[PDB]
Each structure stands twice: as C-alpha cells, then as structure tokens.
From a paper:
Herein, we provide high‐resolution structures for an [name], from the predatory bacterium [name], which is controlled by a second signaling nucleotide, [name]. The [name] domain architecture is predicted to consist of an N‐terminal cNMP sensory domain (cyclic nucleotide monophosphate, postulated to bind [name] or cGMP), a middle linker region, and C‐terminal catalytic [name] barrel. We reveal that regulation of c‐di‐[name] hydrolysis arises from a domain‐swapping of the “regular” cNMP fold, which undergoes significant rearrangements upon binding of stimulus, communicating a series of conformational changes over 40 Å to license a productive state at the [name] dimer interface. C‐di‐[name] turnover was increased ~8‐fold in the presence of [name] or cGMP, further supporting the proposal that cNMPs are activators of [name].
The negative co‐operativity of the [name]Δ[name] cNMP sensor dimer raised the prospect of a potentially stable (intermediary) state in which the protein could be half‐occupied by a single [name]—this is important given that there is little to no structural information on any intermediary state for other cNMP sensors. In screening for cNMP‐bound [name]Δ[name], lower concentrations of [name] did indeed result in different crystal forms, and we were able to solve the structure of a half‐occupied dimer (hereafter referred to as [name]Δ[name]‐mid) to 2.79 Å resolution. This form has two dimers in the asymmetric unit, each binding a singular [name] molecule, the fold traceable until the end of the C‐helix (residue 114). Strikingly, the conformational cNMP swing‐out between the apo and bound forms is replicated to an intermediary degree in the [name]‐occupied chain of [name]Δ[name]‐mid, with a rotation of ~30° and translation (at β‐hairpin) of 10 Å (aligned via C‐helices which again do not shift relative to one another). Significantly, the empty sensor chain of [name]Δ[name]‐mid adopts the “fully outward” domain juxtaposition observed in both chains of the apo‐form. Using the distance between the Cα atoms of hinge residue Asp95 and small helix Ile62 as a measure of P‐loop migration, the [name]Δ[name]‐mid structure (16.7 Å) sits between that of the apo‐form (20.1 Å, swung out) and two‐site bound state (14.6 Å, swung in). The nucleotide‐bound pocket of [name]Δ[name]‐mid reveals [name] to be bound in the syn conformation; of the two full‐length, bound‐state structures of [name], this pose resembles the cGMP complex (syn) more closely than the [name] complex (anti). The result of this difference between the different forms is that the full‐length complexes position the neighboring Arg108 residue (corresponding to the conserved hydrophobic cap in other cNMP sensors; Kornev et al, 2008) in an orientation that promotes full cNMP body:C‐helix closure (2.6–2.9 Å from the carbonyl of Ile55), whereas the [name]Δ[name]‐mid syn [name] complex results in a kinked conformation of the Arg108 cap (5.15 Å away from Ile55), resulting in the partial domain closure observed.
Residue numbers in the entry:
A (entry chain A): 4 to 114
B (entry chain D): 5 to 111
Write the structure that this text describes.
Amino acid sequence: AAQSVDIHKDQIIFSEGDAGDCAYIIEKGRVLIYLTKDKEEIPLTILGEGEIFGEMALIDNQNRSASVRALEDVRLAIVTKQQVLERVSTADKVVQLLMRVLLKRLRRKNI
Amino acid sequence: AQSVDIHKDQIIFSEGDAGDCAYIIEKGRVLIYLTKDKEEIPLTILGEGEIFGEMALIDNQNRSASVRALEDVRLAIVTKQQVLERVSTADKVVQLLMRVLLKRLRR
Ligand SMILES: Nc1ncnc2c1ncn2[C@@H]1O[C@@H]2COP(=O)(O)O[C@H]2[C@H]1O
C-alpha cells in the first residue's frame, strides 16, 4: 500500500510548525519550500520530480521546519515510517548498515 | 570475505588518507576522531556490526576522519566496488533517503 496524493496548484502541503508524520517524493509538478516572517514570505528552494521533502519529520518525528506549497498541479508519493522500516529490513546487509550509521550521524549533527 | 585483525590502539586509517574500502566491525570497538594541532577531538565510538569508511567511497575523495582501535578489533573488508554496486542496486526510496541524508550531513 504505497499511496499517492494529487495536490492542486497553490495548495499548502504543510506549514512551518505543523505535526510531522511522513515525507513526500514528488512524482509530478514542482513545490516551493518557504518561511513566512511578519506577513512576508521568504523562499528557500523549489523542488521538482523525483525529489523528497519532509524527511526530518520521518527520521526524528518532530515539527515542520518550513512551509511547503504547490507551484502547479503536483502528485506526491507518501513515505511513511512503516514503509521505510519494511524497505530497509528487506534490503541488502550493506545498505541496511549504511542507513543505520547515516541516521545515527544525522542525530549527532542536529544536536 | 576477507577479514583483518587490528591491535588495540592501532590507527586503522587517518584523516586525509586515500580511500579504497569500507569496514564492518566484527569484534571490538573503534574511535572515529579528528586531530587539531596535536589535540585529538573524538566524534563517535562504533562497535560490533557497524560500518565505517563509506564516505571516501560514495563521495569519491579522501578519509574525512581518523579511526583507531580502542581494543583488539576484527574488521570485515567491504570493497568500494561492492558498496557502489549494493547502493546502486538498492530500492529507489532507500536510495532517495540516503541521498538527502548525505546532502544534509554535508551542509
Ligand atoms: N561524524 C563523522 N565525521 C567524519 N566521519 C565519520 C563521522 N562518523 C562516522 N564517520 C565515519 O568515519 C569515516 C572516516 O573516513 P570516511 O571518509 O571514508 O568515512 C567516514 C565515516 O564512515
């Protein structure tokens, strides 16, 4: 059950401060990552097809650091913790080992 | 599968060395560290079933840190060719996660 979701142009996918449960892979369209500071919207990046966002919510299970809006009609593949564990557990030993030390390193970094 | 034993306090490799393979710790523990002006700054300690020395392989440059054995250790050698082969053949979503992790670790 790898589910997709379609998102209309100009839809806020999520907002800075929101609860974070999953990441998203862009299957079609583009998205704006941004912050809002005193009613002024400050862009950070634009992501397109085959790129992933919201991944700190996935590994660390905490709030959204930025807002994300769709610049056009987009499709998103939802990536949930259950999928990640399932895919890492079923992976090759060396790949599993790399994923572990990467995640362990990213936790020490973000301290 | 070739293994290698490393004596306690042996430098496995050093920051700045050429990087040809990674290692999975089969026995013992290892210290990952940097050296700044004869002062040694620890980063992490890894133990059994953990892997190091990947970064030279996937990013294709030198060793970013030094590694020493804290006790007698045994290491399974994983050649560069194996690591690239196994990561490239891995599942699309897993590859995508590894990329953004690495991109984050660089920033
Ligand atoms: N915080 C870290 N900084 C640099 N290297 C690290 C760190 N944690 C683990 N390592 C590992 O130490 C290794 C040092 O040589 P590599 O560049 O080949 O790959 C590195 C990583 O696998």
